[PDB]
Design an enzyme around this catalytic site. Structure first.
Site, PDB file in Angstrom:
ATOM      1  N   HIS A 189       0.796  -1.230   0.000  1.00  5.69           N
ATOM      2  CA  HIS A 189       0.000   0.000   0.000  1.00  5.69           C
ATOM      3  C   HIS A 189       0.829   1.280   0.000  1.00  5.69           C
ATOM      4  CE1 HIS A 189      -3.715  -2.158   1.875  1.00  5.69           C
ATOM      5  NE2 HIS A 189      -3.888  -2.012   0.572  1.00  5.69           N
ATOM      6  N   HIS A 216      -9.118  10.203   0.565  1.00  4.13           N
ATOM      7  CA  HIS A 216      -8.274   9.032   0.424  1.00  4.13           C
ATOM      8  C   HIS A 216      -6.976   9.205   1.194  1.00  4.13           C
ATOM      9  CE1 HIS A 216      -5.695   6.061  -1.725  1.00  4.13           C
ATOM     10  NE2 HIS A 216      -6.823   5.382  -1.836  1.00  4.13           N
TER      11      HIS A 216
HETATM   12  O1  YCI Z   1      -4.570   1.729  -0.140  1.00  6.93           O
HETATM   13  C1  YCI Z   1      -5.149   1.979  -1.245  1.00  6.93           C
HETATM   14  O2  YCI Z   1      -4.779   2.961  -1.934  1.00  6.93           O
HETATM   15  C2  YCI Z   1      -6.314   1.100  -1.716  1.00  6.93           C
HETATM   16  C3  YCI Z   1      -6.320  -0.252  -1.414  1.00  6.93           C
HETATM   17  N1  YCI Z   1      -7.290  -1.073  -1.779  1.00  6.93           N
HETATM   18  C4  YCI Z   1      -8.348  -0.597  -2.465  1.00  6.93           C
HETATM   19  C5  YCI Z   1      -9.380  -1.484  -2.847  1.00  6.93           C
HETATM   20  C6  YCI Z   1      -9.329  -2.829  -2.512  1.00  6.93           C
HETATM   21  C7  YCI Z   1      -9.682  -3.234  -1.237  1.00  6.93           C
HETATM   22  C8  YCI Z   1      -9.644  -4.576  -0.889  1.00  6.93           C
HETATM   23  C9  YCI Z   1      -9.258  -5.522  -1.825  1.00  6.93           C
HETATM   24  O3  YCI Z   1      -9.213  -6.878  -1.475  1.00  6.93           O
HETATM   25  S1  YCI Z   1     -10.641  -7.713  -1.485  1.00  6.93           S
HETATM   26  O4  YCI Z   1     -11.694  -7.024  -0.649  1.00  6.93           O
HETATM   27  O5  YCI Z   1     -10.500  -9.025  -0.749  1.00  6.93           O
HETATM   28  F1  YCI Z   1     -11.145  -7.950  -2.999  1.00  6.93           F
HETATM   29  C10 YCI Z   1      -8.907  -5.119  -3.103  1.00  6.93           C
HETATM   30  C11 YCI Z   1      -8.947  -3.776  -3.450  1.00  6.93           C
HETATM   31  C12 YCI Z   1     -10.473  -1.002  -3.553  1.00  6.93           C
HETATM   32  C13 YCI Z   1     -10.550   0.343  -3.897  1.00  6.93           C
HETATM   33  C14 YCI Z   1      -9.537   1.217  -3.523  1.00  6.93           C
HETATM   34  C15 YCI Z   1      -8.428   0.736  -2.802  1.00  6.93           C
HETATM   35  C16 YCI Z   1      -7.398   1.620  -2.426  1.00  6.93           C
HETATM   36  O6  YCI Z   1      -7.467   2.772  -2.719  1.00  6.93           O
END
Ligand code: YCI
Length: 441
Positions: free
Chosen positions: A102, A327
């Site tokens: 991240h 964000h």
């Molecule tokens: O830190 C960051 O910038 C971010 C990290 N994740 C994001 C997700 C996301 C969350 C969980 C996931 O995993 S899941 O729920 O198991 F499918 C997959 C994608 C979805 C949308 C935005 C962000 C984001 O902005």
């Protein structure tokens, strides 16, 4: 100003609220330095878009993309970058399940020196368009002369700490950047690095990462004041993990306990959590699609309804950004009347065990699933006992070197009885958003 804390530009706000904000094109402009090479640490990439954000004259300079994608997702990223012969990729190892890369960071190597940018935005158009995002811009770090032996270290240990963060990847492309950093003088740095990297940390290493790293810094470099139990903790985030069946499992046991540390000596402390309500999202500049970047699932939320009594609406009149969904992630320690703060942290870390760490093995081990990165502003690092809160984020205070630009409104406002936290995977079909649409996932 000493802090060099910025927000990204928001399309649609009055110019007053973008003067002193930064777009990615500003950060990469030749005015900031003559680019030789760059590293882009991030989660999500639009490579076509990203290369267009560099000045035309710099678009063929080497770029390293540091990501966490595997399997088909990794293949998609490589296919995005294949058009551009100057782009290399580094896949950060994620050896603990459910971890993610991240960290949002730019390493910018110039003819004139080196710059580090630690921020909160993905490298996609929508994250820089109408969201509230945070940026820390390092000084221009000069090169240490060949043959000169000096540390180039800051009083906050930032140089060694950044090298330590990069060493955790065990990656040859990042050893090259470590050697670049060794060659530069980072001594002007006045922020502390707070990183998370995946692993299980015991002994001395426990204080290196996550919420134990925060606790160690607050113990060593902040001091406790009388009535400290009255100084709230504020956490502000765009995603929520599974925190457990009640507040004692993690949130108000180990997480809050690290956040409330001040000084070296030995809880009533109010805890404010700021997270967009459904109404915040519906009336936002993006409308319901802003909720695509607020990934709180119904499966997680229905297991922890106790948590939502801590939730406060997003409001940012101070920076003209109440309709620019957050964000950015921030954590801070305001005084009881919110006029001062004991510290401020901007980070990629959301409110989750994966990001901050969870104690294991009878409290002797901190387990972290993810890479995260942020910077901590402590008054002691600026010759101060506290920061006065800037009344208007983009204004001209009578003392800019003592006045911290908090990007949202204080005190935070509790959800109303009819408010609900934004939950991204259920439908909202009762009232349309600012674009005239409903939300049907
Ligand atoms: O830190 C960051 O910038 C971010 C990290 N994740 C994001 C997700 C996301 C969350 C969980 C996931 O995993 S899941 O729920 O198991 F499918 C997959 C994608 C979805 C949308 C935005 C962000 C984001 O902005």
């Amino acid at each position: 100003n000493p802090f060099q804390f910025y927000l990204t530009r928001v399309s649609g706000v009055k110019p007053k609220y973008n003067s002193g904000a930064l777009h990615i094109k500003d950060i990469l402009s030749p005015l900031f330095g003559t680019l030789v090479s760059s590293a882009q640490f991030n989660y999500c990439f639009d490579v076509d878009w990203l290369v267009k954000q560099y000045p035309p004259e710099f678009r063929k300079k080497p770029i390293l993309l540091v990501h966490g994608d595997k399997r088909e997702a990794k293949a998609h990223l490589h296919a995005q970058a294949k058009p551009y012969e100057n782009i290399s990729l580094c896949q950060a190892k994620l050896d603990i399940a459910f971890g993610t890369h991240h960290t949002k960071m730019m390493l910018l190597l110039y003819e004139e020196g080196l710059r580090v940018v630690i921020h909160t935005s993905n490298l996609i158009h929508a994250d820089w368009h109408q969201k509230t995002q945070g940026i820390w811009l390092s000084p221009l770090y000069p090169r240490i002369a060949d043959g000169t032996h000096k540390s180039g270290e800051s009083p906050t240990h930032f140089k060694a700490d950044l090298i330590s963060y990069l060493m955790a990847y065990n990656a040859p492309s990042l050893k090259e950047w470590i050697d670049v950093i060794h060659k530069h003088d980072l001594s002007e740095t006045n922020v502390y690095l707070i990183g998370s990297t995946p692993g299980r940390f015991q002994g001395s290493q426990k204080d290196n990462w996550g919420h134990f790293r925060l606790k160690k810094l607050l113990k060593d470099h902040a001091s406790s004041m009388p009535n400290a139990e009255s100084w709230p903790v504020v956490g502000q985030f765009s995603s929520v993990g599974s925190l457990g069946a009640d507040e004692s499992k993690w949130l108000c046991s180990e997480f809050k306990e690290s956040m409330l540390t001040l000084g070296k000596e030995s809880s009533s402390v109010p805890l404010y959590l700021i997270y967009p309500s459904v109404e915040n999202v519906r009336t936002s500049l993006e409308g319901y699609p802003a909720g695509g970047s607020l990934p709180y699932s119904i499966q997680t939320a229905e297991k922890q309804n106790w948590l939502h009594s801590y939730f406060h609406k997003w409001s940012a009149e101070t920076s003209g950004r109440s309709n620019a969904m957050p964000h950015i992630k921030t954590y801070m320690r305001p005084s009881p009347d919110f006029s001062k703060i004991a510290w401020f942290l901007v980070t990629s870390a959301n409110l989750s065990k994966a990001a901050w760490g969870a104690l294991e093995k009878n409290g002797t081990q901190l387990m972290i699933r993810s890479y995260e990165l942020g910077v901590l502003f402590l008054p002691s690092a600026f010759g101060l006992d506290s920061f006065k809160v800037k009344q208007k984020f983009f204004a001209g205070s009578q003392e800019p070197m003592a006045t911290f630009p908090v990007p949202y409104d204080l005190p935070p406002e509790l959800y109303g009885s009819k408010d609900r936290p934004w939950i991204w995977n259920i439908p909202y079909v009762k009232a349309p958003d600012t674009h005239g649409n409903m939300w049907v996932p």
